[PDB]
Design a protein around this ligand. Structure first.
Ligand SMILES: CCCCCCCC/C=C\CCCCCCCC(=O)O[C@@H](COC(=O)CCCCCCCCCCCCCCC)COP(=O)([O-])OCC[N+](C)(C)C
Ligand SMILES: CCCCCCCC/C=C\CCCCCCCC(=O)O[C@@H](COC(=O)CCCCCCCCCCCCCCC)COP(=O)([O-])OCC[N+](C)(C)C
Ligand SMILES: CCCCCCCC/C=C\CCCCCCCC(=O)O[C@@H](COC(=O)CCCCCCCCCCCCCCC)COP(=O)([O-])OCC[N+](C)(C)C
Ligand SMILES: CCCCCCCC/C=C\CCCCCCCC(=O)O[C@@H](COC(=O)CCCCCCCCCCCCCCC)COP(=O)([O-])OCC[N+](C)(C)C
Ligand SMILES: CCCCCCCC/C=C\CCCCCCCC(=O)O[C@@H](COC(=O)CCCCCCCCCCCCCCC)COP(=O)([O-])OCC[N+](C)(C)C
Ligand SMILES: CCCCCCCC/C=C\CCCCCCCC(=O)O[C@@H](COC(=O)CCCCCCCCCCCCCCC)COP(=O)([O-])OCC[N+](C)(C)C
Ligand SMILES: CCCCCCCC/C=C\CCCCCCCC(=O)O[C@@H](COC(=O)CCCCCCCCCCCCCCC)COP(=O)([O-])OCC[N+](C)(C)C
Ligand SMILES: CCCCCCCC/C=C\CCCCCCCC(=O)O[C@@H](COC(=O)CCCCCCCCCCCCCCC)COP(=O)([O-])OCC[N+](C)(C)C
Ligand SMILES: CC(C)CCC[C@@H](C)[C@H]1CC[C@H]2[C@@H]3CC=C4C[C@@H](O)CC[C@]4(C)[C@H]3CC[C@]12C
Ligand SMILES: CC(C)CCC[C@@H](C)[C@H]1CC[C@H]2[C@@H]3CC=C4C[C@@H](O)CC[C@]4(C)[C@H]3CC[C@]12C
Ligand SMILES: [K+]
Lengths: 200, 67, 117, 200
């Protein structure tokens, strides 16, 4: 026959196919977006690491504080640099703590939380330095290194958390599975309703 | 209470409402018919009144669509 | 499917040629004037050119690249302005008054036809 | 008659003519692109040249190092300047080594390979300077000069290699010759096939 329910059921097939396509397409989009970040992080080695020298270069860089709502606040801070041992190079390389720090100023080992007062960023860098200054010959850190591209830079932290990576690939797969269930339940309803209609 | 995010709860409430309902509809189409293989009415008067409200047919209905 | 295939194929192929030519500069200039554009940045550039939007956030800087963009402007604008209206015209003509009548218990109905005006 | 092969043979003529046209057009395009570079290099004279003074100006310029993948690294280096004799001006002119150096900073005679450490660019400029500092009164260099436009600048190297110039004009000519051979062999096939068909 034809039936009254055909319009809603065929629209339900169009939705289920659009979700299958959108699941696969967003999987490729996130695939290319995460390709360079995921390789650039997961190619970094994990190593045991020990401090071997510390110093200030006798010169200052500028950070920018924010008040909240439209401030620039450009303010000087001491440039402290720290050199560390690692299992691959076994030689002098500059510690940068987090990746962001390296990307924003690789000549210093730290950037303080920038503030309206020069004195607070000075004492913050002193309060940070007096830790790594005493860690000379201490029990090893665990730290990250990249011999293929960064033979003289060292990191304390990863470039991204695996949670945000996982969520970007979970919801495309869930979208695809939901689309498949909509297609299957709709085709099941269409093909079973005609058996019930003949059996009535 | 800063330092925590909840955006996923707002989005999930919409996704779960839309798809959760849709599956209830479909699962209902697969269970009603399957039961028959395994084993003027009052409803229409409510549907008539609701249809007569959804269009501007009555004073009440024309006040509703202006709102 | 013919219009979609030719449009997408031309766009992705032309984006690849400008990618190669901008990343490897003018030979006379001893290859020194190259520009580090990704492939996706070249795909975006050609869409912004075909549509005639032309933001100039990104544009071809090499002479070979500017050369190619002159021939792409002559061919690709006519391709976009012809194909995009027609691909949109072949989609979404959804018949609004398909479907069928559902009768309800205790309520009769009549069918009216002929000179409906 | 008409023959079945006419379509492929006439398309082969369209290709051979397109290659003749593209050969001539690319010859003019490379002609205008190389015109200013080729004149600006080949107008420079070649001369016997001798060092006559050397000094640092007591002030520093900044270079930029790269780590590979997205670094700025702006870092100071010593500005050393060197003055040299030449056969045309017979007078004090500043040596710049390669053309690029002159274009990027003409106040200094050298730019070091820029590095993450100020000390390495300092000692690199010292290690370079101690050569030209002793070459006072040595056996002549052969060096390049431009009296029409650069009467006080001197170069150790050419602005381009003749190999990349040669390749830019070789492949247009090869493209034209290949196009002519396609036209000739296609017309030869068309005009000989009718003689063979009459002789059969
Ligand atoms: C559903 C898709 C699943 C998304 C998966 C995302 C997964 C990423 C989230 C993982 C956990 C969140 C971490 C919190 C955090 O890091 O705070 C950092 C600051 O936070 C912000 O500035 C806003 C936080 C929400 C980001 C995106 C919100 C809507 C954007 C729409 C996102 C795409 C919209 C359209 C996509 C085509
Ligand atoms: C209680 C609050 C409001 C209830 C409104 C009274 C209901 C009566 C509506 C009657 C009607 O036909 O709409 C009228 C316009 O409607 C208006 O008087 C203002 C609203 C019109 C557009 C809504 C945007 C404001 C037009 O009516 P008519 O056909 O021109 O006669
Ligand atoms: C530059 C260096 C790198 C090169 C980069 C760019 C240069 C090349 C990129 C695009 C060129 C290929 C596109 C093309 O040839 O379109 C043709 C593909 O041919 C057919 O579809 C068969 C037609 C018979 C169009 O053929 P058509 O289908 O006949 O056209 C449709 C209209 N027709 C049906 C109405 C009449
Ligand atoms: C299958 C789907 C395939 C589509 C997959 C798209 C992936 C995009 C990846 C972008 C990316 O890596 O960003 C880079 C920048 O790139 C940009 O600046 C991007 C600019 C927008 C790109 C729009 C592409 C649309 C293609 C539409 C084609 C439609 C037809 C497709 C037919 C196959 C990263 O920047 P960086 O400097 O390396 O850091
Ligand atoms: C960019 C444009 C891509 C092409 C669009 C397209 O092909 O939609 C297709 C949807 O075909 C379907 O039935 C599934 C719809 C999901 C397509 C998701 C696209 C991503 C169009 O196919 P159609 O709607 O069957 O075409 C009939 C045209 N009519 C609407 C006038 C009757
Ligand atoms: C169909 C017919 C189509 C064209 C017929 C040709 C008509 C004019 C061609 C003359 C070419 C010519 O003048 O050579 C010139 C460059 O020119 C080039 O070689 C650039 C190549 C472009 C072609 C050489 O110029 P010059 O030797 O530098 O001349 C001295 C001027 N200068 C003092 C500043 C040194
Ligand atoms: C016969 C064919 C004749 C065509 C010959 C074309 C030669 C192009 C030479 C370009 C050149 O010398 O570059 C200069 C910059 O110039 C630019 O920035 C070029 C920008 C693109 C030019 C496109 C020309 C298209 C003409 C299409 C006309 C179709 C008819 C050099 O830069 P500078 O700053 O001197 O260093
Ligand atoms: C066939 C044409 C013959 C080309 C003659 C080229 C001749 C120039 C080459 C001469 C020798 C190469 C020297 C190597 C070198 O200097 O390394 C320097 C770094 O190298 C790079 O960055 C990429 C090297 C390739 C440059 C161009 C590749 C494709 C560009 C497409 C070139 C034009 C594409 C379209 C043209 C209309
Ligand atoms: C009944 C209708 C609204 C269906 C929608 C389902 C929605 C409301 C469900 C699905 C997921 C649920 C949320 C997920 C978990 C949390 C975190 C908790 O700390 C507050 C409640 C909150 C935010 C839930 C509220 C209810 C919730 C949003
Ligand atoms: C509230 C959300 C979650 C679900 C909405 C209720 C759904 C699940 C149930 C409740 C009442 C049911 C409907 C009752 C009336 C009709 C009319 C019939 O001609 C089409 C299907 C249809 C038969 C049923 C479809 C399934 C249904 C809509
Ligand atoms: K525009």
């Amino acid at each position: 026959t034809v039936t009254a329910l055909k319009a809603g059921e065929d629209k339900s097939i169009r939705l289920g196919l659009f979700l299958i396509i959108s699941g696969v397409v967003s999987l490729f989009i996130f695939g290319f977006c995460w390709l360079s970040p995921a390789l650039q992080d997961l190619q970094a080695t994990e190593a045991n690491c020990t401090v071997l020298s510390v110093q200030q270069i006798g010169e200052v860089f500028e950070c920018t504080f924010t008040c909240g709502a439209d401030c620039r606040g450009t303010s000087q801070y001491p440039c402290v640099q720290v050199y560390v041992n690692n299992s691959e190079s076994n030689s002098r390389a500059l510690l940068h703590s987090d990746e962001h720090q390296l990307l924003t100023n690789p000549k210093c080992s730290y950037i303080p939380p920038c503030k309206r007062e020069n004195q607070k960023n000075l004492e913050s860098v002193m309060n940070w330095q007096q830790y790594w200054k005493d860690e000379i010959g201490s029990q090893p850190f665990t730290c990250y290194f990249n011999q293929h591209q960064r033979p003289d830079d060292v990191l304390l932290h990863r470039t991204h958390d695996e949670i945000v990576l996982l969520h970007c690939f979970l919801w495309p797969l869930v979208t695809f599975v939901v689309g498949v269930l909509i297609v299957v339940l709709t085709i099941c309803a269409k093909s079973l309703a005609v058996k019930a209609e003949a059996m009535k | 209470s800063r330092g925590q995010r909840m955006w996923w709860a707002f989005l999930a409430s919409s996704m779960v409402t839309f798809f959760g309902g849709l599956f209830i509809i479909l699962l209902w189409r697969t269970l009603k018919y399957l039961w028959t293989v395994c084993c003027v009415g009052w409803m229409t008067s409510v549907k008539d009144w609701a249809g007569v409200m959804i269009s501007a047919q009555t004073l009440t209905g024309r006040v509703l669509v202006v709102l | 499917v013919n219009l979609l295939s030719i449009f997408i194929s031309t766009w992705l192929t032309a984006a690849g040629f400008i990618h190669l030519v901008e990343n490897s500069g003018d030979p006379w200039e001893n290859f020194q004037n190259n520009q580090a554009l990704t492939y996706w940045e070249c795909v975006y550039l050609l869409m912004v050119t075909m549509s005639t939007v032309g933001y100039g956030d990104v544009y071809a800087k090499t002479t070979l690249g500017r050369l190619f963009m002159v021939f792409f402007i002559l061919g690709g604008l006519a391709m976009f302005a012809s194909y995009v209206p027609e691909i949109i015209e072949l989609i979404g003509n959804r018949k609004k008054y398909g479907g069928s009548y559902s009768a309800v218990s205790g309520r009769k109905h009549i069918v009216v036809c002929g000179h409906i005006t």
